[PDB]
Design an enzyme around this catalytic site. Structure first.
Site, PDB file in Angstrom:
ATOM      1  N   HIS A  10      21.067   9.981 -13.248  1.00 58.62           N
ATOM      2  CA  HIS A  10      20.927   8.558 -13.522  1.00 58.62           C
ATOM      3  C   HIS A  10      19.847   7.904 -12.660  1.00 58.62           C
ATOM      4  O   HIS A  10      19.566   8.352 -11.549  1.00 58.62           O
ATOM      5  CB  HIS A  10      22.259   7.838 -13.275  1.00 58.62           C
ATOM      6  CG  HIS A  10      23.370   8.290 -14.171  1.00 58.62           C
ATOM      7  ND1 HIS A  10      23.854   9.580 -14.164  1.00 58.62           N
ATOM      8  CD2 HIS A  10      24.104   7.616 -15.088  1.00 58.62           C
ATOM      9  CE1 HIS A  10      24.842   9.680 -15.036  1.00 58.62           C
ATOM     10  NE2 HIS A  10      25.013   8.503 -15.610  1.00 58.62           N
ATOM     11  N   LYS A  65      22.214  15.668 -19.331  1.00 59.32           N
ATOM     12  CA  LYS A  65      22.260  14.220 -19.539  1.00 59.32           C
ATOM     13  C   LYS A  65      21.322  13.453 -18.615  1.00 59.32           C
ATOM     14  O   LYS A  65      21.295  13.698 -17.407  1.00 59.32           O
ATOM     15  CB  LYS A  65      23.691  13.722 -19.339  1.00 59.32           C
ATOM     16  CG  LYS A  65      23.853  12.230 -19.370  1.00 59.32           C
ATOM     17  CD  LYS A  65      25.280  11.875 -19.051  1.00 59.32           C
ATOM     18  CE  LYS A  65      25.498  10.386 -19.045  1.00 59.32           C
ATOM     19  NZ  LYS A  65      26.888  10.092 -18.732  1.00 59.32           N
TER      20      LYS A  65
END
Lengths: 227, 233
Positions: A122, A149
């Site tokens: 992230h 991700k």
């Protein structure tokens, strides 16, 4: 096709709301980093209290999460999570200064327990250039996980197309599933049209957005159905 | 968020449900696109009667799409330009669509466009490619030449074969938006390109086309849903 994830952060009425959206949910993501001193026992007690795969995520404060655990206590929690049978997917974070071997050791262990692994990264501050996005995806897929991700904060339209291009190119080469997220409403398109560009997972909410740009999984499901 | 305008494309014949369907969607329609190429021997007089037959809630766009660009219009290149040019005498028209392609008489085209604008008509120069999607750089070049005539809108519709084709169309339109002082409309056709139609405003687009009944082009959806999509992004 794209699977819809409903992100929750508990600690009954929520069960009321989940079963309500049961048809819009392919994956329930139990964030746990919102509990002080979480134990695998506590987690296992929560899960047993709950049609969809179950993802368990511990997001470190160093990545937008509320989790305050050392690299070691965090890593051990991830490894211990493997013991819970009701867990289908576990999220392990990535960051270059990471102890590679140890990570690869922890990941192979989770897969040894037939858990689907999701290596994530992230960046709530900005969106790296295309090449850097493609690169970060590369490093994360080196541990041969089930899903890679990458959530990033756009500051302009190009940051959005770049995140989309990276994930698209990736899904066209790698034999690994990819998840790309351009945060904020500016990047809502990454969430709704995730499948169009090869994305395998898209995250929505069950009431209030759990992350920047998320919409109710009921709406998100309707959207993913359109594309 | 966004200020895209939703366009409703209709292709009626010279001759009520339609006008009612239109009123049932008046809050989703910013622009009514009256295609007219589906008229054999269509004349300016015939069109003017149809226009009058149509409100005040929305702008009126008249479009004669030639077959060479995916339309039904078989009129020669000269009957075309004279038709496009004579649509300026119709007071009820707010926007006119003029096609562009590589083999265009630049001088002649600019004359018609200046003409339409001097008659208080906003001009939409458009280019369609139903075969494929030229490379990014190509797309941008097409937008560059079209905006050379200084229209109110430049519109480019291309057919994607992959995800990159869609991203290039979106990129070209977004880059045009950040630089040029002219409105742009970017469309990646078919379902693969639907994102271009719904998130059009996110990437700088000024117009997104939809239908009232059946799709008038590959990729269109009802204007009510498109309206809702544009409201979501």
């Amino acid at each position: 096709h794209v699977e819809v994830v409903a992100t929750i952060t508990p600690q009954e009425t929520l069960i009321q709301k989940i079963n309500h959206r049961i048809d819009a949910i392919d994956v329930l993501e139990l964030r746990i980093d919102q509990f002080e001193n979480v134990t695998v026992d506590q987690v296992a007690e929560m899960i047993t209290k709950l049609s969809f795969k179950l993802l368990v995520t511990y997001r470190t404060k160093l990545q937008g999460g509320y989790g305050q655990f050392t690299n070691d206590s965090y890593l051990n929690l991830i490894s211990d999570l493997a013991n819970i049978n009701g867990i289908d997917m576990i999220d392990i974070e990535w960051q270059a200064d990471i102890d590679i071997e140890k990570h690869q050791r922890i990941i192979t262990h989770l897969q040894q327990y037939n858990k689907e692994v999701i290596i994530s990264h992230h960046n709530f501050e900005s969106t790296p250039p295309l090449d850097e996005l493609q690169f970060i995806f590369f490093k994360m897929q080196k541990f041969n996980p089930e899903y890679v991700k990458l959530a990033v904060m756009p500051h302009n339209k190009n940051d959005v197309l770049n995140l989309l291009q990276a994930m698209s190119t990736f899904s066209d080469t790698m034999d690994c599933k990819v998840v790309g997220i351009s945060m904020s409403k500016l990047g809502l398109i990454s969430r709704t049209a995730q499948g169009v560009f090869g994305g395998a997972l898209t995250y929505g909410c069950i009431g209030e957005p759990q992350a920047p740009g998320q919409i109710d999984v009921t709406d998100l499901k309707a959207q993913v159905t359109l594309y």
